[PDB]
């Protein structure tokens, strides 16, 4: 059951994908609002996917070794120049994480977009599936495609100070490494903003 | 039923799985408005107290059920015991504004007072946790989060109740821990 995504001009086509899961909505709410006086100019140039290395999966890691990633992370291309040149913006996130095994090692990796992150105290983790998630395990699907719309206490925010979403990747089952299966499996993320709007051109150096 | 599962599709199966006729459900006592309409106690209290939400005890009903959702929105029914004049102002108010008193104030009724103070915070909807640095590195909620600031000459108790509340984006609830047994085994009425 293959699945071909597409954003901007780059594409990630993963055969192992089981299905996209939307978070909290199928689509964002209205963009125009009293704040900014409808000065927003939808910039679709940043819809690119960008890789990002994540905590390496090792037979060692027990249940609950959370590896978080704050969003938007340092991005050094179009999106970075944008968030440094514009004051306010907003985006849906459309994350995509892929852990490629040899299909001979068992382990259930749980990837969930949790908004407004705050350190869990190892009792909360059991309840980490409350938000948008997909179980990425070598036995069935090597990828998880989650797309969440931007949501925050305001219509727009300064990404320099307020970072709503954090892609957390909890290790539900320790990766059992068989002789045939890969002992260590790395985790890479295709994170790609969607419906990115901006506002208020900001004077740069 | 053997669903795909690892796609995390919300699959559920009743009793009809093995010749079981399912019975009706009434799910009113768990409505998020009826579970938030009830009062709650805020502790501690002192003169010049920000009536800012999530200052309630964690394990209380309204407390936990509100910390069960990242984003909430609600109109407050405030109930204060007080001893003098009680003045109340919205989130965007300079500390000095409380004194003058034409901005709403309730004189000392013989029992405690009761007041409706609406949702005044300028943000679209409030939050229980704010990730990111303070405005100009701690999860320290911004001052615009609190609904209002009350000052009376002295406050004995304070109760709060959220009306017409709707909660967004649920969060973990973190039930009590029990060990060295299999049921919590609390004394029952």
């Amino acid at each position, epitope marked *: 059951r293959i699945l071909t995504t597409r954003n901007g001009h780059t594409t990630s086509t993963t055969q192992s994908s089981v299905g996209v899961t939307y978070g909290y909505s199928t689509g964002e709410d209205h963009v125009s609002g009293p704040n900014t006086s409808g000065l927003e100019t939808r910039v679709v140039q940043a819809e690119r996917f960008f890789k990002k290395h994540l905590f390496d999966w090792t037979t060692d*890691k027990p249940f609950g070794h959370i590896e978080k990633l704050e969003l938007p992370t340092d991005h050094k291309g179009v999106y970075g120049q944008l968030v440094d040149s514009f004051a306010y913006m907003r985006n849906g996130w459309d994350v995509e994480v892929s852990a490629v095994g040899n299909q001979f090692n068992g382990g259930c990796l749980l990837v969930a977009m949790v908004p407004e992150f705050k350190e869990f105290t190892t009792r909360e983790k059991y309840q980490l599936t409350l938000f948008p998630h997909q179980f990425i395990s070598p036995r069935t699907n090597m990828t998880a495609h989650i797309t969440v719309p931007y949501l925050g206490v305001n219509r727009y925010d300064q990404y320099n100070k307020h970072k709503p979403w954090t892609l957390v990747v909890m290790v539900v089952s320790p990766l059992t*490494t068989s002789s045939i299966g890969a002992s260590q499996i790395k985790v890479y993320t295709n994170i790609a903003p969607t419906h990115v709007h901006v506002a208020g051109e900001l004077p740069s150096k | 039923t053997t669903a795909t599962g690892e796609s995390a599709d919300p699959v559920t199966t009743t009793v009809e799985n093995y010749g079981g006729e399912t019975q009706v459900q009434r799910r009113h006592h768990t409505d998020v408005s009826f579970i938030m309409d009830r009062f709650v106690q805020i502790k501690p209290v002192s003169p010049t107290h920000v009536i800012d939400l999530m200052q309630t005890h964690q394990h209380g009903l309204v407390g936990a059920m509100l910390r069960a959702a990242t984003y909430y929105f609600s109109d407050l029914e405030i109930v204060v015991n007080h001893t003098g004049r009680l003045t109340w102002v919205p989130n965007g108010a300079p500390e000095a504004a409380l004194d003058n008193t034409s901005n709403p104030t309730a004189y000392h009724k013989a029992p405690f007072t009761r007041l409706a103070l609406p949702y005044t915070a300028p943000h679209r909807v409030l939050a229980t946790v704010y990730n990111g640095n303070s405005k100009y590195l701690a999860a320290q909620l911004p001052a615009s989060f609190n609904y209002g600031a009350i000052r009376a000459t002295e406050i004995q108790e304070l109760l709060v109740r959220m009306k017409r509340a709707e909660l967004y984006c649920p969060r973990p609830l973190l039930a009590v821990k029990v060990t060295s047994q299999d049921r919590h085994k609390q004394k029952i009425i």
Partner: antibody
Amino acid sequence: TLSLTCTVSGFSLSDYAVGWVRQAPGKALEFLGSISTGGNTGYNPALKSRLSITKDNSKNQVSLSLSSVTTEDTATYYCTKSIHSYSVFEYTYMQYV
Amino acid sequence: AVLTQPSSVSGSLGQRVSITCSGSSNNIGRYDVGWYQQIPGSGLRTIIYASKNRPSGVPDRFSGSRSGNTATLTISSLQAEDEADYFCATGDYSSSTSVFGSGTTLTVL
């Protein structure tokens, strides 16, 4: 024997596993033993049958003692709280504090 | 034991200094190592646990890399209090814990 049981400050010993480690004179280290929070214990396969590891779960006190203590067994013993309630293997414990 | 590190390391304040830790596919190739710190006094105040993350309560400079088959500790800037005996520690797949870190006498130079 030799018991150098250090109790935990806060940090409910209910959900956290603990392990002790010996730092030989100078700088030379060996992992002594670790007890999973579920009551399960893990200790070096080389170093066994002399260690008494147990977790009072109620008094926030962890118990270990060494028998046949000899002068060569001597170190600046520590105790450190692991970030995992249980360890998949008996030896991988050292990795997490 | 088998986990070998440069027993001495030269570094100075102003530039980044690293610490290499080398072992094979048994020990490091598929197991997370741990970087601890010790000043001459005492302690295991962990610079890097789980190979990738520093414990909450340490400056962000200490970066920990689990590249190739040997875990490397990278101090982006040193300080005077930076010098101590760092240690590399991890488990071996076909052996015991072997937390063996020879220790890297560090110097501010």
